């Protein structure tokens, strides 16, 4: 405490016991060595070794591509 | 010009028949969409290792009667220079000069 400015008592004087390991916290990763990035692999953010969705078709067994007659 | 690419192409057609015939749609049957819940597994994905030279995708041809560095023409079995040369001498049939 000072004569020209005192400490306040409005929200900052409540709950003298908490923690991360004394008490629950919704967030982790506050050490410098545990922190995220959300890396997703390049050119495999989705799928590219893919199961077909532009050339899927029923099973056969020939040798060529739309040969038809010949 | 230059015989080595013409030499490659002449070997290739017997090697098309030998490697590629038995392994045409086999890529598709064992790996791609024809492999609909059948195949797609390692114990069958070793079978196609012989064809690579035999493939139609390396069957470029060039000039079928001499060889030529690019500029082949598929309807004659010939090229730019060699077409004009054969036409001078009248060896090509049906041949007009364009006028209409």
Swiss-Prot record, chain A:
Keywords: Acetylation, Metal-binding, Ribonucleoprotein, Ribosomal protein, RNA-binding, rRNA-binding, Zinc. It comes from the Bacteria. InterPro entries: Ribosomal_bL28/bL31-like_sf, Ribosomal_bL31, Ribosomal_bL31_A, Ribosomal_bL31_sf. One of its GO terms (molecular function) is zinc ion binding. Zn(2+) binds at residue 16. The keyword rRNA-binding applies. Binds 1 zinc ion per subunit. Only 1 ligand appears to be Cys, the other are thought to be His and either backbone amides or solvent. Its cofactor is Zn(2+). One of its GO terms (cellular component) is cytosol. The modification N6-acetyllysine is found at residue 8. Changing residue 16 to S: No Zn(2+) binding. SUPFAM superfamilies: L28p-like. Proteolytically cleaved by protease VII to yield a peptide lacking residues 63-70. It is not clear if this is due to protein degradation or is a bona fide processing event in the strain used in PubMed:339950 and PubMed:10556732. In strains B, D10, MRE-600 and Q13 the only protein seen in PubMed:10556732 was full-length; the last 7 amino acids were sequenced only for strain MRE-600. Signal peptide: none annotated. GO terms for biological process: cytoplasmic translation; negative regulation of cytoplasmic translational initiation; translation; translational initiation. Binds the 23S rRNA. Belongs to the bacterial ribosomal protein bL31 family. Type A subfamily. Part of the 50S ribosomal subunit. This is Large ribosomal subunit protein bL31. The gene is rpmE.
UniProtKB/Swiss-Prot annotation, chain B:
One of its GO terms (biological process) is translation. InterPro entries: Ribosomal_uS14 (IPR001209), Ribosomal_uS14_bac/plastid (IPR023036), Ribosomal_uS14_CS (IPR018271). Keywords: Ribonucleoprotein, Ribosomal protein. The keyword Ribonucleoprotein applies. SUPFAM superfamilies: Glucocorticoid receptor-like (DNA-binding domain). Part of the 30S ribosomal subunit. Contacts proteins S3 and S10. HAMAP family: Ribosomal_uS14_1. NCBIfam families: PRK08881.1. Binds 16S rRNA, required for the assembly of 30S particles and may also be responsible for determining the conformation of the 16S rRNA at the A site. This is Small ribosomal subunit protein uS14. It comes from Escherichia coli (strain K12). The gene is rpsN.
């Amino acid at each position: 405490m000072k004569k020209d400015i005192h400490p306040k008592y409005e929200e900052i004087t409540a709950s003298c016991s908490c923690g991360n390991v004394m008490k629950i916290r919704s967030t982790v990763g506050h050490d410098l060595n545990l922190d995220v990035c959300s890396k997703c692999h390049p050119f495999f953010t989705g799928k590219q070794r893919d199961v077909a969705t532009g050339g899927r078709v029923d099973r056969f067994n020939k040798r060529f591509n739309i040969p038809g007659s010949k | 010009a230059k015989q080595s690419m013409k030499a490659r192409e002449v070997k290739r057609v017997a090697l098309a028949d030998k490697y590629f015939a038995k392994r045409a749609e086999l890529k598709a049957i064992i790996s791609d969409v024809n492999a609909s819940d059948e195949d797609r597994w390692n114990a069958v994905l070793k079978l196609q290792t012989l064809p690579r030279d035999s493939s139609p995708s390396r069957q470029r041809n060039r000039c079928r009667q001499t060889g030529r560095p690019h500029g082949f023409l598929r309807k004659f079995g010939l090229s730019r220079i060699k077409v004009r040369e054969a036409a001078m001498r009248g060896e090509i049939p049906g041949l007009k000069k364009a006028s209409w």
